[PDB]
A and B are shown apart, each in its own frame.
Chain A
Amino acid sequence: AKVAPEPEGELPYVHPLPHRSSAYIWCGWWVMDEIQKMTEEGKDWKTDDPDSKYYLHRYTLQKMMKDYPEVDVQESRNGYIIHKTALETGIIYTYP
């Protein structure tokens, strides 16, 4: 219910896709693993822990999901494009 603190600028670029009101950013395997770990102990990834190792990328993901309702984020372990609804829960494919 809170907003994520802004960690200065230098936000990673998000590519607007007006084709489907979507966007695209390449995060990787570390960001997705971090988000999956955060959404396993009952924590939150959208705004909690504003001093994380890769919180800047998570804040960028939160902004991308707020601005675009059907975001297409691609990881690096499998290169899958998880949508906004699939990224909402914080669990991507597998693993505890």
Chain B
Amino acid sequence: GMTLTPGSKAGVFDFQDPIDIRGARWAGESFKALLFQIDKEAVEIARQTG
């Protein structure tokens, strides 16, 4: 839904997928992209539960 990046896999977050890691490179960028993804998940939780 809202958390999904338009071109992602819709349910999983794979570090090997360029659209999922916001065009990251090596290790720091991809893991920070994961951090941003979990931030988006928390925000979606806040929207859902209220």
Contacts and interface: CB of A to CB of B under 8 A. Distances in A.
Interface of A: 78, 93-94
Nearest to B23: A94
Contacts of B25: 78
Overall SS of chain B's interface: loop
Interface of B: 18-19, 23, 25
A78 B18 CA distance: 13
Contacts of B19: 94
A77 to B, nearest CB: 9
A79 to B, nearest CB: 10
A78 B23 CA distance: 11
B20 to A, nearest CB: 11
5 contacts: A78-B25, A93-B18, A94-B18, A94-B19, A94-B23
Nearest to A79: B25
A94 B19 CA distance: 8
